[PDB]
Amino acid sequence: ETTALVCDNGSGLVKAGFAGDDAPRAVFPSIVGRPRHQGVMVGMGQKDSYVGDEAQSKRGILTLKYPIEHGIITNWDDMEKIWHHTFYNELRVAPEEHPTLLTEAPLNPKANREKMTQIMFETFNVPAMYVAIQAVLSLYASGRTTGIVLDSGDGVTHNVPIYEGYALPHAIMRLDLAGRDLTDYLMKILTERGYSFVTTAEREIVRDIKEKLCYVALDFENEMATAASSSSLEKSYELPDGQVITIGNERFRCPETLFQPSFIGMESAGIHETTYNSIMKCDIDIRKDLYANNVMSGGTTMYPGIADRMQKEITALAPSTMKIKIIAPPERKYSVWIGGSILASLSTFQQMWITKQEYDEAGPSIVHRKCF
């Protein structure tokens, strides 16, 4: 019949597909490329801009900007391209003809919501729209009604406690460490081994290193001394030209910054201590049900070792008699979109959508009243 679109604007990926699907139909980096060089040939192709995997095809010739930084849309005319590319090229489907669901971080400036709504009706004339908190959808994907969601994406890390389907909006934590700023630290220490990675297209080369080779120390001083003691950790990577580069203690040292934001020069404590300090804000009766239901979410939690580090370190904060449990399906990178696909299909949800007529009557303020 007619099936809602589900679209999730990360900082580092777009995931999109139809509701009811098992997995997203199109994924590509939320990146816009422009040429930065003199055109030599007439009869060369002309395009003003390359979006996503096109821009990743030709990155050597391009300047690459992300429109989203710390989950905030920083300029609109690029993002409106990324959505144009998504609906017309990737999904090959008219946005005029399907409900659409759009996915955002829990605290970011509320103009971001206003404009994100405004474009869907005013530019695309989508029939119906909603906006949903990522940490909620992580529970729908996990198949739970009660839990604390730890979420870390490309651009934002946040916690939300949810107990029996009630959120605790006083209890919510946000951190602006994320996979991007791990990558920016990874460049700066990679320099110490005498490899130098300067430019915007070259940063993605670093990002591939971070994805392939990093892992999280279980005991940081022992693994540091072990790497100092021997090559046994040391592992090496090819480069697109065929150079090989070889990396030692460093390959774990970046994931450690999520637990010690002192390295990057943040004030706030690691994701473990902020998770605990989120739990403390909940009523004591709740807390046993959160301590079991820790849910990992988002791609930055994909590193091997992070579940064991989380359990081992939050265990040392909690009262000993509790059980700590950590729930990390390998789906989890997808899970925010899977959850949104689950939500968008429910019949109860159909009774709430921002509808075109209601938007026209209310104006773009309507989101703040209706949506949350």
Partner: peptide, 7 residues
């Protein structure tokens, strides 16, 4: 953002 951070 608009203040405490670059976005």
């Amino acid at each position: 953002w608009x203040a405490x951070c670059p976005a």
